[PDB]
Amino acid sequence: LKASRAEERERKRRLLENLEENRKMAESKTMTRSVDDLLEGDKNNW
Amino acid sequence: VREIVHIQAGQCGNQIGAKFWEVISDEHGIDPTGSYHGDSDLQLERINVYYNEATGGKYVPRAILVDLEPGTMDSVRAGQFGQLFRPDNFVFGQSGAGNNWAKGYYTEGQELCESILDVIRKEAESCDCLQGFQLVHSLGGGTGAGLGTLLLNKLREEYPDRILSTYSIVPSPKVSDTVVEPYNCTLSVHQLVESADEVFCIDNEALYDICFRTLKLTTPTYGDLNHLVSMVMSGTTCALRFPGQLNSDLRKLAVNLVPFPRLHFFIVGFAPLTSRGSQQYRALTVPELTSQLFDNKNMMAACDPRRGVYLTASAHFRGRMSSKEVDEQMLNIQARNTSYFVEWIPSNVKSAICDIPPRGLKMAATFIGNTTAFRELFTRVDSQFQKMYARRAFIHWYVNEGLETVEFDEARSNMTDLIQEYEMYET
Amino acid sequence: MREVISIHVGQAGVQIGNGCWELYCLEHGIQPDGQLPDAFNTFFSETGAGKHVPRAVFVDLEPTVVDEVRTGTYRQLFHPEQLISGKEDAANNYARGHYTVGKEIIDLTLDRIRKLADQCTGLQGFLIFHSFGGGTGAGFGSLLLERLSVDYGKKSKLEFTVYPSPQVSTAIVEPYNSILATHSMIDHSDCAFMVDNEALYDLCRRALDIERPTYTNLNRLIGQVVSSLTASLRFDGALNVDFTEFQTNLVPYARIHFPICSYAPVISAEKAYHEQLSVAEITNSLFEPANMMVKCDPRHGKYMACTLLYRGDVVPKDVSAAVATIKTKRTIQFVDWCPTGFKMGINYQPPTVVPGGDLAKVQRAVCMLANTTAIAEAWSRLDHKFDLMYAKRAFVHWYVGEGMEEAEFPEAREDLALLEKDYDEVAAES
Amino acid sequence: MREVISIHVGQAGVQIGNGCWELYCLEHGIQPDGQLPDAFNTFFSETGAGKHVPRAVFVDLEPTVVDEVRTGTYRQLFHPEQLISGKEDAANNYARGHYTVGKEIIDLTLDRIRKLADQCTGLQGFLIFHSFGGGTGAGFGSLLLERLSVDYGKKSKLEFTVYPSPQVSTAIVEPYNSILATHSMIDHSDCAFMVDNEALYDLCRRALDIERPTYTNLNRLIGQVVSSLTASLRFDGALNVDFTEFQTNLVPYARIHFPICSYAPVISAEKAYHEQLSVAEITNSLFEPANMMVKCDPRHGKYMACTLLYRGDVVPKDVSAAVATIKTKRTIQFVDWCPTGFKMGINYQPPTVVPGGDLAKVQRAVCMLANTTAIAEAWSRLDHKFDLMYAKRAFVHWYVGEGMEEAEFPEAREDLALLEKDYDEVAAES
Ligand SMILES: Nc1nc2c(ncn2[C@@H]2O[C@H](COP(=O)(O)OP(=O)(O)OP(=O)(O)O)[C@@H](O)[C@H]2O)c(=O)[nH]1
Ligand SMILES: Nc1nc2c(ncn2[C@@H]2O[C@H](COP(=O)(O)OP(=O)(O)OP(=O)(O)O)[C@@H](O)[C@H]2O)c(=O)[nH]1
Ligand SMILES: Nc1nc2c(ncn2[C@@H]2O[C@H](COP(=O)(O)OP(=O)(O)O)[C@@H](O)[C@H]2O)c(=O)[nH]1
Ligand SMILES: [Mg+2]
């Protein structure tokens, strides 16, 4: 019945794998790739 | 990601193109200020085909406007959708048009040629992929016919692989707006035959005939005429922009419809065109579209298909409809009128279906066909060019620009050979 | 357990595919997300304790068809790697899909199919779908099989392709693509099943009660045949048929492999209420020319060995009486050197109905695969259409410009001609 | 016990070292200030109280990169004598970083290295980081190895260098610097590993779904390899590999020592959802051309012995099954006089993740170090680039002016020529 341990030990991994790693990555790359828009500033007028 | 670069030349090109972007902007849902204000996610799927994004949710079309005199452009910008275009794509001269093919080709063309190409280079190399270019110009004028052909050769040399689809307006038989048209059209044809992949021919008289016969427009203006042209140019590229049960893009159309390198000139037509009062009686059926597309009066080119024979035909259908019903009609129309089709090519009718129709209209269709009736259109200009050439007419205007008299003999020899080539394949 | 891999090419292959996997997930009891609210191993893999994944690869050279799946409800089921899309399609040009653009994507896909074959411990074959008229279906389909032949070798590669119709046609260059792909198909494929849209249009309007069908309904009917074909590997049955058995039993020679399809009963919901539909009834309906999925009349030719697959309430006693009766039918011919002529299979699990499907639920149904000389009728029509265009050489310039040498046009034309008398020699008897 | 020294030279080394010490401190559980909220002693010294100090020496001849660390978070961690800075950088000039300016700071640097080693009861190796193209990475790196050979002798000196990429290049005089440093490396270094940015960029987009990486993301990937490399000295396991075992197992001759590295799985969260990633799969992912961190195809040459390291719940039964499968691969060529071909490594400590990271918390991962003849072609690219400059004497005036003799230029060309000969003679048939 060590197989009972293994099921929990690996489902715990893939819940962490899915919710946290993916969602953290999705938000971070949404911010990082959309900071390529660098729309100047009114101070430019020299 | 099959981006297309749009080029407009002359008064005819700029006014047709300005109406064209009104159609697409409404179809996708772009506010005239350039911001998306639409109603469906499907509109943002493949807007990259024609537009670029400016930082901050503003979309700019891939348009280049060309003219020799700046009068027409400032008329375009004052239009409601004038603000949309990129200001630095407006490339113009400061000299009169001259209504002269030679003057546009040699005198003012060379000066503007270098500036226009780099503007092309910006839009051409700013996209992930490029399928082909799109040219709109008239052949009776001097700027569209003269400078338009010069740019056509330059585009081919740099970008041989891409599809140089062009839309042209042919000088009319009965009443026309220029004396020297036979010279302008004859010289331009030599450039179109060898360089461009696809040419669509529009006649202004047929547009008047369609308006008075079907649409019953009591006082049509040039807005109504250019409205009809915008739909066909909308329909052909719709396979790129929206999903469908059977896709058919530009490269498919050229392969199927063009059997030989020089026979690629086409006629177009659009259904359904409904009268004001006949609306209450007309029932939307797939056969109802089929009747209008193949009816001779619906063709936008004033060359009667019945006087010649078909080589290939193609139809596009827009909306959700049955696939069986579409395929049956093409089979039926082919067998019912076998006298107008060539024997040595079976299954002359190509078909395709697209999912999203033009807004509000629950089905629509577009037709593109290739036929031997174009011998009618070229015989006309050859006859007029002959009488204008036999004695030297206005020609001295063209010689004083740099053009050699041998170019006229070269131009007509090529034009007459293209007439004979259609004669032979009729056998 | 025992594994099968599905590969889908082109618009036809992909949008047939999502219809088939819609059936299969519904049949086993798997939600669109891959979870559950057995025989999964033949088609799916388990990642950890909860989630399943199809053994499929979707390939097309243009993104419109694939991205419909990517944004759909089923998007979470598939692995992102399985959905492979090119940049620009082949434009119904065999040369473009074989030489210029096909080689741009061939090696990327071959790794992905091979990688999936590692997970299949007891792999026994592949299923591949084509549309003959399509550039990617014919052009890239030939390149895929040529590589796959040397990659795996002694594995059963079955194909399920759409033969261009006798009269219904959507491509002008359609005869050119079919013949060129046929020469590559014949040497490499173990066996490939013929179907055409025109026969499916008539059947699904006559038997199934639909005025105005689309490709969606036709894709369902294809799924029923493939589901019954694979039913022996998944669920219990009194007479099981593995993939390798179809290869040996059906094809008498190497080049004569092409079978045809049939299925019965196809009946509307409110007519199946009206009719008995026993074992003998459905067996009789299989042999009528109307139920054939290829629009060629078998009465023009002769039958070699045929394979029957029954599902549901069928009992082995009634099977033997039914097929024995069909031998008494003198409107059916058999070649003399095939006195046995039949291969039968019986399975227990009934067909799986669909939410909002048109097919009724009979508790007993039968599927047929038959090899006949009547297919030579279809080859003659395809050859005649090709011959007219090639005499004046109406479309050679497009193919030559895209990497194709002309000398391939007559060679593939001769190889078809050899096949035409291959079938005529078999049709004779001594 | 058992301890290793880390020395970082040039921008490319010290910036990677920043990522390395973040990962090590996070893995062991030490706050960046050096306190706690084991295997510590292999990388750190315990000064007393509750504080830890790394065994690291940061060196570059211009202070901008070092002053980032002095002002950065880790300023509380290091021993400021470890942080060594010059006045003006080498300007990508080999002679400047070796003859004129490099000798100004070398004797101060060697003191810190030997002082750091007195506190090391049981040292067993060194880790040194280079970029070949840089003046300080190559010119001063060459001067550093030459002295440490006489200072320490028969202690394994391992290097980790960025190999000049095929097409991506940031220095015009870059090919000049690599060949000059190659002469010094070949005699003194015990073994030097190769990575290059061009493969890491493509690896950092395809597997890890990153639109546009930076130097930060690539530096973490290199940190994982070094952490996996040294884990055999730190954590418990089943098959330990000491530093000296690398020296004998990998290199057959004296001048064929340069290996290349690989790691698996490098996967995002989305894809690992659909993939189990067991022992057999991750071993197959190693040998693909895509996963090589140097953009050279192994299929061009043959393999000498490789060393494999496993981190996770890995059972030795599965290790032999996977490698036996790998020997069944006919696309991987091994040399006949290397019939053994492999060394295994298994450890129980899984990979460590980082906040704001790019990788998944997979249960197991494998690191590969490989010796191959395919990298002989890589030098021939560097040789060809060098010849085009020197045929016209393209940049000789800069090097000659800084003390460098011109006679060294043909000699360095000669040493590379012999090295290229040695590879073709090793790879030749038995
Ligand atoms: N039964 C069935 N046939 C289809 C379906 N869709 C397309 N076809 C057939 O497929 C053929 C057209 O070729 P494509 O489907 O575009 O195949 P392709 O390889 O993607 O062609 P390319 O555009 O060159 O890539 C036609 O003969 C259709 O009859 C479908 O949904 N069901
Ligand atoms: N992986 C990685 N490589 C880097 C990084 N920074 C620089 N490089 C590489 O370093 C190579 C050039 O070496 P240099 O940056 O000149 O290092 P150097 O030895 O200090 O040379 P000098 O600045 O002249 O003193 C380039 O090709 C870069 O690819 C980094 O942060 N990460
Ligand atoms: N369909 C259409 N034709 C036009 C329009 N404006 C001008 N034309 C026709 O285009 C022909 C030549 O136009 P032209 O002024 O010479 O344009 P150019 O190429 O710039 O010289 C004339 O016969 C006009 O009748 C328009 O808005 N729509
Ligand atoms: Mg396709």
Ligand SMILES: [Mg+2]
């Ligand atoms: Mg530096």
